[PDB]
Amino acid sequence: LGWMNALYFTRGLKLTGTYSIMIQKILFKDLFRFLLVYLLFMIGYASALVSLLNPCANMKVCNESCRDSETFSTFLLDLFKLTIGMGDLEMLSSTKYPVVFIILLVTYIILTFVLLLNMLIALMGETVGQVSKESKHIWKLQWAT
Amino acid sequence: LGWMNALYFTRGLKLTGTYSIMIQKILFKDLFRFLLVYLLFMIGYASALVSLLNPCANMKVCNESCRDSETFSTFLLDLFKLTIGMGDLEMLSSTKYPVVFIILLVTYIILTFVLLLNMLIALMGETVGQVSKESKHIWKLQWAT
Ligand SMILES: [Ca+2]
């Protein structure tokens, strides 16, 4: 916590504290609400997938480490490991294991991992251009305080 | 689908629904046409490569899992796995396995995976600066509706 508070002094010389402006928007509003809505999305879809193994018979083919179970939440752990935008999950053709599960999985992960974070990246790129006077102004405001 | 519709309420307070602006352009026009043209590119080049094993004798040297076959489309699966911009595919010198196949492969993947998505990234970076009045305007339009 003290090395966090080290930011308190890091808002004076050398134009330090510019982050202290943008954290006013990203931590409280933008990244906050984004992580909320995305967490809700992914937990809902997690319930979906853990319910979508009985038809499209129980199989969650090994990732690119939960096996078929019913315990309480190990599903969520291994499934989140799967949701990691890590390795461009496998493609299918002439399905043998769960058939309609895979298409839902791929379209969902494309929705959430090719648009949502990109939505937020574009949001950053557009919102950063708001600093007009609050550079010298917050500088002398630091002076004052 | 209900958790998709959760975006319907997520367009009011806290300036939610900014995505609902950009999705007007990226989902229907930009990312759409880009994925279309890129899919066409890659499937054409896939036909090319699966036809380019007989001279430059049959060999698709193990990636950085289809072996020489003739079945129907396993080519497409393993080849797409190869097309994943995953690991900066191997370099060659003093060729022994297919000779002119590798140079075509590398120049194609450089074309499609160092320019096309970068073309679209620059397109994003330039198109995001269009919000002039439709922030407060779409806000009060949400109000109205
Ligand atoms: Ca890696």
Q: Under an 8 A CB cutoff, do A91 and B77 touch? A: yes
Partner residue opposite B129 with nearest CB, options A45, A91, A126: A126
Helix (H) or strand (E) run with residue A108 in it: helix A100-111
| Residue positions counted in chain B | 145
Within an 8 Å CB–CB cutoff, is residue A29 touching chain B?
Answer: yes
Task: Give the closest residue to B116 by CA, choosing from B56, B55, B33.
Answer: B33
A2 touches chain B (CB under 8 A): no
B68 labelled ligand-binding: no
By the CB < 8 Å criterion, does A37 face chain B?
yes
b/e burial code for range A79-98 (CB count within 10 A of at least 16 → b): beebbeeeeebeeeeeeeeb
Task: Report which residue type is found at B125.
Answer: G
Burial class (CB in 10 A: 0-12, 13-18, 19+), A105: buried
User: For residue B93, what are the contacts with CB-CB under 8 A and spacing of at least 6?
Assistant: none
| CB of B38 closer than 8 Å to CB of B31 | no
Q: Which site among B84, B120, B130 would you substitute to test the A interface, given the most A Cβ atoms closer than 10 Å to its Cβ?
A: B84
Amino acid identity at A10: T
Nominal resolution in Å?
4.2
CA of A129 to the centre of ligand 1 (A): 32
Q: Do B15 and A29 touch (CB under 8 A)?
A: yes
Start-to-end C-alpha separation, chain A: 22
**Structure-block tokens of residue A125:** 């790129």
- What are the distances in angstroms from CA B29 to CA A81, A120, B26, B94? 32, 19, 6, 45
* H, E, C per residue of chain A: CHHHHHHHHCCCHHHCCHHHHHHHHHHHHHHHHHHHHHHHHHHHHHHHHHHCCCCCCCCCCCCCCCCCCCCCCHHHHHHHHHHCCCCCCCCCCCCCCCCHHHHHHHHHHHHHHHHHHHHHHHHHHHHHHHCCCCCHHHHHHHHHC
The pair of structure tokens assigned to B37 is 């043209």
Burial B15-32 (b: 16+ CB within 10 A, else e): bbbbbebbeebbeeeebe
